[PDB]
Amino acid sequence: MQYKLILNGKTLKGETTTEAVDAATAEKVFKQYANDNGVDGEWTYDDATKTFTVTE
Numbered sequence: 001m002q003y004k005l006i007l008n009g010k011t012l013k014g015e016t017t018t019e020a021v022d023a024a025t026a027e028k029v030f031k032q033y034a035n036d037n038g039v040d041g042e043w044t045y046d047d048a049t050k051t052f053t054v055t056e
Contacts, residue, residue: 001050005030008055009039027052
């Protein structure tokens with residue numbers, strides 16, 4: 001499935017996507033993406049839109 005990540009970081013803002021077998025998998029991929037880009041924040045997941053958010 002294709003998942004979306006919306007970043008509302010102090011420095012980095014915007015949207016990215018990834019393909020993963022399920023949401024728990026996508027969450028790990030996106031948490032690594034956020035970490036690798038310097039973001040550490042609060043998370044949501046909305047299954048009804050396949051969208052994660054991370055907010056600082």
